[PDB]
Short mmCIF file of C-alpha atoms in Angstrom, two decimals:
data_model
loop_
_atom_site.label_atom_id
_atom_site.label_comp_id
_atom_site.label_asym_id
_atom_site.label_seq_id
_atom_site.Cartn_x
_atom_site.Cartn_y
_atom_site.Cartn_z
CA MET T 1 4.98 -16.15 -0.86
CA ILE T 2 2.49 -13.96 0.55
CA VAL T 3 1.74 -10.79 -1.43
CA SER T 4 -0.08 -8.14 0.56
CA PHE T 5 -1.28 -4.71 -1.00
CA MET T 6 -1.61 -1.65 0.83
CA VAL T 7 -4.14 1.38 0.12
CA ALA T 8 -5.65 4.34 1.57
CA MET T 9 -9.12 5.54 0.53
CA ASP T 10 -11.39 8.56 1.73
CA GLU T 11 -14.89 7.90 3.03
CA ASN T 12 -16.33 7.12 -0.49
CA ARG T 13 -13.40 4.59 -1.38
CA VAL T 14 -11.68 7.46 -3.59
CA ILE T 15 -8.23 7.04 -3.92
CA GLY T 16 -6.06 10.16 -3.89
CA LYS T 17 -3.17 10.85 -6.21
CA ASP T 18 -0.93 7.66 -6.83
CA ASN T 19 -2.25 6.22 -3.59
CA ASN T 20 -0.49 8.92 -1.58
CA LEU T 21 -2.51 11.27 0.91
CA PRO T 22 -2.94 14.83 0.57
CA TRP T 23 -1.37 17.59 2.72
CA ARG T 24 1.43 15.17 4.17
CA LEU T 25 -1.50 13.28 5.92
CA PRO T 26 1.19 10.65 7.70
CA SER T 27 -1.69 8.50 8.32
CA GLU T 28 -0.92 5.84 5.66
CA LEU T 29 2.70 6.28 5.96
CA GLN T 30 3.01 5.65 9.73
CA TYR T 31 0.81 2.54 9.27
CA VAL T 32 3.13 1.08 6.19
CA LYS T 33 5.97 1.74 8.57
CA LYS T 34 4.63 -0.39 11.56
CA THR T 35 2.88 -2.95 9.52
CA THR T 36 5.73 -3.83 6.81
CA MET T 37 8.62 -3.92 9.34
CA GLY T 38 11.12 -7.00 8.59
CA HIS T 39 9.54 -7.57 5.29
CA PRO T 40 10.20 -6.31 1.66
CA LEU T 41 8.22 -2.98 1.14
CA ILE T 42 7.70 -2.66 -2.74
CA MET T 43 6.72 1.07 -3.72
CA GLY T 44 5.82 2.76 -7.20
CA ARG T 45 8.33 5.58 -7.47
CA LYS T 46 5.56 8.33 -6.50
CA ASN T 47 5.01 6.64 -3.22
CA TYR T 48 8.80 6.40 -2.38
CA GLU T 49 9.20 9.90 -3.45
CA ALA T 50 6.56 10.90 -1.25
CA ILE T 51 8.42 9.22 1.89
CA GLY T 52 11.60 10.43 0.48
CA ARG T 53 13.86 7.95 2.10
CA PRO T 54 14.29 4.23 2.52
CA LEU T 55 12.39 2.81 5.65
CA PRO T 56 14.57 1.10 7.94
CA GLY T 57 14.79 -2.72 9.07
CA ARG T 58 13.36 -3.57 5.80
CA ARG T 59 14.27 -3.99 2.00
CA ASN T 60 12.93 -1.13 0.07
CA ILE T 61 12.13 -1.68 -3.55
CA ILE T 62 10.91 0.64 -5.96
CA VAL T 63 8.89 -0.65 -9.02
CA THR T 64 9.22 1.40 -12.23
CA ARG T 65 9.41 0.96 -16.11
CA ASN T 66 12.16 3.74 -16.07
CA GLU T 67 15.36 2.02 -16.75
CA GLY T 68 17.84 4.80 -15.69
CA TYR T 69 15.86 5.46 -12.41
CA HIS T 70 18.64 4.90 -9.21
CA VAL T 71 18.00 5.50 -5.78
CA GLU T 72 20.30 5.35 -2.71
CA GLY T 73 19.63 2.83 -0.34
CA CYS T 74 17.08 1.11 -2.63
CA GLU T 75 16.66 -1.72 -5.04
CA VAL T 76 14.91 -0.57 -8.17
CA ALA T 77 12.85 -3.20 -10.12
CA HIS T 78 11.31 -2.74 -13.84
CA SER T 79 8.28 -5.16 -13.88
CA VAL T 80 6.28 -7.76 -12.04
CA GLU T 81 8.91 -10.11 -12.83
CA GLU T 82 11.76 -8.49 -11.57
CA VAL T 83 9.98 -7.81 -8.26
CA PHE T 84 9.06 -11.41 -7.76
CA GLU T 85 12.84 -12.29 -8.67
CA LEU T 86 14.30 -10.15 -6.11
CA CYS T 87 12.13 -11.56 -3.49
CA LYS T 88 12.15 -15.18 -4.36
CA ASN T 89 13.21 -16.12 -1.13
CA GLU T 90 11.19 -13.93 0.88
CA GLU T 91 7.90 -15.29 2.83
CA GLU T 92 5.87 -12.26 2.47
CA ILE T 93 6.03 -8.68 0.21
CA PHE T 94 4.06 -5.70 0.96
CA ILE T 95 3.35 -3.45 -1.96
CA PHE T 96 2.39 0.23 -1.74
CA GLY T 97 1.54 1.80 -5.07
CA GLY T 98 -0.74 3.42 -7.23
CA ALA T 99 -3.52 2.16 -9.62
CA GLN T 100 -1.18 1.08 -12.38
CA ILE T 101 0.87 -1.06 -9.64
CA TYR T 102 -2.42 -2.65 -8.14
CA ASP T 103 -3.44 -3.71 -11.44
CA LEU T 104 -0.19 -5.13 -12.26
CA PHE T 105 -0.17 -7.19 -9.18
CA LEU T 106 -3.79 -7.86 -8.83
CA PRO T 107 -3.64 -11.88 -9.82
CA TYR T 108 -1.01 -12.56 -7.26
CA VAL T 109 -2.49 -10.45 -4.14
CA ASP T 110 -3.39 -12.53 -1.37
CA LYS T 111 -4.28 -9.91 1.39
CA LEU T 112 -5.41 -6.41 1.25
CA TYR T 113 -4.98 -3.87 3.79
CA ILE T 114 -7.02 -0.93 3.47
CA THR T 115 -6.90 2.27 5.19
CA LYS T 116 -10.26 4.13 5.39
CA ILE T 117 -10.36 7.70 6.30
CA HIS T 118 -13.63 9.31 7.50
CA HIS T 119 -13.38 12.18 5.29
CA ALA T 120 -13.72 13.24 1.69
CA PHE T 121 -10.63 14.31 -0.19
CA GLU T 122 -10.36 15.33 -4.03
CA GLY T 123 -9.49 12.23 -5.75
CA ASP T 124 -10.00 10.58 -9.37
CA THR T 125 -9.91 6.82 -8.99
CA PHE T 126 -12.80 4.76 -7.36
CA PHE T 127 -11.83 1.33 -5.46
CA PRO T 128 -14.68 -0.83 -5.85
CA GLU T 129 -16.35 -2.58 -2.88
CA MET T 130 -14.70 -5.84 -1.88
CA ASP T 131 -16.05 -9.18 -3.30
CA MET T 132 -16.86 -11.02 -0.45
CA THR T 133 -17.83 -14.02 -1.94
CA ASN T 134 -13.91 -14.07 -2.69
CA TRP T 135 -12.37 -11.79 0.14
CA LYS T 136 -12.98 -12.51 3.94
CA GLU T 137 -12.22 -9.82 6.32
CA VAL T 138 -10.06 -10.84 8.84
CA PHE T 139 -9.94 -7.83 11.26
CA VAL T 140 -11.05 -4.31 11.54
CA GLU T 141 -8.80 -2.03 13.75
CA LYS T 142 -9.47 1.76 14.75
CA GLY T 143 -6.61 4.18 13.71
CA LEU T 144 -5.12 6.34 16.42
CA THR T 145 -6.62 10.02 15.83
CA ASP T 146 -4.02 12.80 16.83
CA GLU T 147 -2.60 16.01 16.19
CA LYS T 148 -1.27 14.61 12.85
CA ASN T 149 -4.05 12.74 12.28
CA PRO T 150 -7.05 14.67 12.61
CA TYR T 151 -9.61 12.32 11.21
CA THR T 152 -11.55 9.35 11.99
CA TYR T 153 -9.98 5.98 10.41
CA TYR T 154 -9.83 2.38 10.26
CA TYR T 155 -7.65 -0.19 9.00
CA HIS T 156 -9.80 -3.44 7.15
CA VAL T 157 -7.72 -6.24 6.47
CA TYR T 158 -8.72 -8.75 4.10
CA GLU T 159 -7.63 -12.14 2.71
CA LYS T 160 -8.30 -13.77 -0.43
CA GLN T 161 -10.19 -17.07 0.44
CA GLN T 162 -10.33 -19.21 -2.89
#
Protein backbone atom coordinates (compact mmCIF):
# COMPACT_ATOMS: atom_id res chain seq x y z
CA MET A 1 0.00 0.00 0.00
CA ILE A 2 1.38 3.32 -1.15
CA VAL A 3 1.43 6.16 1.38
CA SER A 4 1.60 9.63 -0.14
CA PHE A 5 2.01 12.82 1.88
CA MET A 6 0.93 16.23 0.59
CA VAL A 7 2.47 19.45 1.86
CA ALA A 8 2.49 23.10 0.80
CA MET A 9 5.39 25.42 1.61
CA ASP A 10 6.44 28.98 0.81
CA GLU A 11 9.46 30.09 -1.21
CA ASN A 12 11.75 29.50 1.75
CA ARG A 13 10.36 26.02 2.52
CA VAL A 14 8.37 27.34 5.48
CA ILE A 15 4.98 25.78 6.21
CA GLY A 16 2.09 27.91 7.42
CA LYS A 17 -0.18 26.96 10.33
CA ASP A 18 -1.10 23.25 10.41
CA ASN A 19 -0.09 22.81 6.76
CA ASN A 20 -2.97 25.13 5.80
CA LEU A 21 -2.49 28.05 3.40
CA PRO A 22 -3.26 31.55 4.77
CA TRP A 23 -6.08 33.89 3.74
CA ARG A 24 -8.19 31.12 2.19
CA LEU A 25 -5.56 30.59 -0.53
CA PRO A 26 -7.11 27.73 -2.52
CA SER A 27 -3.92 26.64 -4.24
CA GLU A 28 -3.23 23.51 -2.19
CA LEU A 29 -6.86 22.57 -1.59
CA GLN A 30 -7.60 22.55 -5.33
CA TYR A 31 -4.57 20.32 -5.90
CA VAL A 32 -5.53 17.96 -3.10
CA LYS A 33 -9.00 17.62 -4.61
CA LYS A 34 -7.69 16.81 -8.10
CA THR A 35 -4.87 14.52 -6.93
CA THR A 36 -6.66 12.39 -4.34
CA MET A 37 -9.84 11.66 -6.30
CA GLY A 38 -10.71 7.97 -5.94
CA HIS A 39 -8.44 7.23 -2.97
CA PRO A 40 -8.65 7.85 0.75
CA LEU A 41 -7.72 11.31 1.94
CA ILE A 42 -6.39 11.33 5.52
CA MET A 43 -6.47 14.74 7.20
CA GLY A 44 -5.59 16.25 10.55
CA ARG A 45 -8.65 17.87 12.14
CA LYS A 46 -7.30 21.35 11.37
CA ASN A 47 -6.94 20.56 7.66
CA TYR A 48 -10.43 19.08 7.50
CA GLU A 49 -11.88 22.04 9.40
CA ALA A 50 -10.24 24.42 6.92
CA ILE A 51 -11.96 22.56 4.07
CA GLY A 52 -15.18 22.40 6.10
CA ARG A 53 -16.67 19.41 4.31
CA PRO A 54 -15.77 15.94 3.03
CA LEU A 55 -14.39 15.96 -0.51
CA PRO A 56 -16.60 13.98 -2.95
CA GLY A 57 -15.73 10.64 -4.53
CA ARG A 58 -13.33 9.40 -1.88
CA ARG A 59 -13.03 8.28 1.71
CA ASN A 60 -12.32 11.18 4.03
CA ILE A 61 -10.56 10.14 7.23
CA ILE A 62 -9.71 12.59 10.01
CA VAL A 63 -6.90 11.50 12.29
CA THR A 64 -7.04 12.96 15.81
CA ARG A 65 -6.17 11.83 19.34
CA ASN A 66 -9.50 13.29 20.41
CA GLU A 67 -11.78 10.36 21.28
CA GLY A 68 -14.92 12.51 21.43
CA TYR A 69 -14.60 14.05 17.96
CA HIS A 70 -17.31 13.21 15.40
CA VAL A 71 -17.80 14.36 11.82
CA GLU A 72 -20.74 13.74 9.49
CA GLY A 73 -19.76 12.06 6.24
CA CYS A 74 -16.21 11.39 7.43
CA GLU A 75 -14.49 8.60 9.28
CA VAL A 76 -12.47 9.41 12.40
CA ALA A 77 -9.24 7.59 13.34
CA HIS A 78 -7.25 8.18 16.51
CA SER A 79 -3.81 6.80 15.62
CA VAL A 80 -1.55 5.76 12.75
CA GLU A 81 -2.55 2.17 13.44
CA GLU A 82 -6.27 3.00 13.21
CA VAL A 83 -5.74 4.77 9.90
CA PHE A 84 -3.88 1.77 8.51
CA GLU A 85 -6.60 -0.58 9.80
CA LEU A 86 -9.31 1.46 8.08
CA CYS A 87 -7.23 1.46 4.90
CA LYS A 88 -5.93 -2.10 4.99
CA ASN A 89 -7.63 -2.92 1.68
CA GLU A 90 -6.67 0.29 -0.12
CA GLU A 91 -3.92 0.33 -2.73
CA GLU A 92 -2.90 3.93 -1.95
CA ILE A 93 -3.73 6.61 0.59
CA PHE A 94 -2.98 10.34 0.68
CA ILE A 95 -2.22 12.22 3.88
CA PHE A 96 -2.73 15.99 4.21
CA GLY A 97 -1.80 17.14 7.72
CA GLY A 98 0.48 19.15 9.98
CA ALA A 99 3.92 18.58 11.46
CA GLN A 100 2.74 16.13 14.10
CA ILE A 101 0.98 14.02 11.48
CA TYR A 102 3.95 14.17 9.11
CA ASP A 103 6.19 12.96 11.93
CA LEU A 104 3.74 10.17 12.80
CA PHE A 105 3.59 8.78 9.27
CA LEU A 106 7.12 9.57 8.09
CA PRO A 107 8.56 6.03 8.43
CA TYR A 108 5.84 4.74 6.07
CA VAL A 109 5.73 7.51 3.45
CA ASP A 110 6.53 6.38 -0.11
CA LYS A 111 5.78 9.57 -2.02
CA LEU A 112 5.91 13.27 -1.18
CA TYR A 113 3.85 15.86 -3.09
CA ILE A 114 5.31 19.28 -2.35
CA THR A 115 3.54 22.42 -3.54
CA LYS A 116 6.03 25.27 -3.42
CA ILE A 117 4.58 28.75 -3.61
CA HIS A 118 6.87 31.51 -4.90
CA HIS A 119 6.04 33.95 -2.11
CA ALA A 120 7.01 34.27 1.55
CA PHE A 121 4.32 33.73 4.18
CA GLU A 122 4.51 33.90 7.97
CA GLY A 123 5.13 30.40 9.30
CA ASP A 124 6.91 28.67 12.17
CA THR A 125 7.94 25.34 10.63
CA PHE A 126 10.81 24.88 8.18
CA PHE A 127 10.61 21.81 5.93
CA PRO A 128 14.17 20.64 5.27
CA GLU A 129 15.67 20.08 1.87
CA MET A 130 14.95 16.71 0.35
CA ASP A 131 17.71 14.14 0.82
CA MET A 132 18.23 13.24 -2.82
CA THR A 133 20.27 10.14 -1.95
CA ASN A 134 17.02 8.59 -0.77
CA TRP A 135 14.40 10.47 -2.76
CA LYS A 136 14.03 10.87 -6.52
CA GLU A 137 12.02 13.66 -8.13
CA VAL A 138 9.48 11.95 -10.37
CA PHE A 139 8.18 15.14 -11.99
CA VAL A 140 7.76 18.88 -11.60
CA GLU A 141 4.57 20.57 -12.75
CA LYS A 142 3.85 24.28 -12.94
CA GLY A 143 0.73 25.35 -11.07
CA LEU A 144 -2.07 27.33 -12.70
CA THR A 145 -1.80 30.99 -11.70
CA ASP A 146 -5.10 32.88 -11.87
CA GLU A 147 -7.33 35.33 -10.02
CA LYS A 148 -7.69 33.10 -6.97
CA ASN A 149 -4.06 31.93 -7.12
CA PRO A 150 -1.93 35.05 -7.79
CA TYR A 151 1.53 33.61 -7.11
CA THR A 152 3.75 31.38 -9.23
CA TYR A 153 3.86 27.86 -7.80
CA TYR A 154 5.14 24.40 -8.70
CA TYR A 155 4.29 20.86 -7.72
CA HIS A 156 7.35 18.77 -6.96
CA VAL A 157 6.64 15.08 -6.57
CA TYR A 158 9.20 12.69 -5.06
CA GLU A 159 9.32 8.94 -4.55
CA LYS A 160 11.28 7.17 -1.84
CA GLN A 161 13.91 5.04 -3.56
CA GLN A 162 15.41 2.62 -1.05
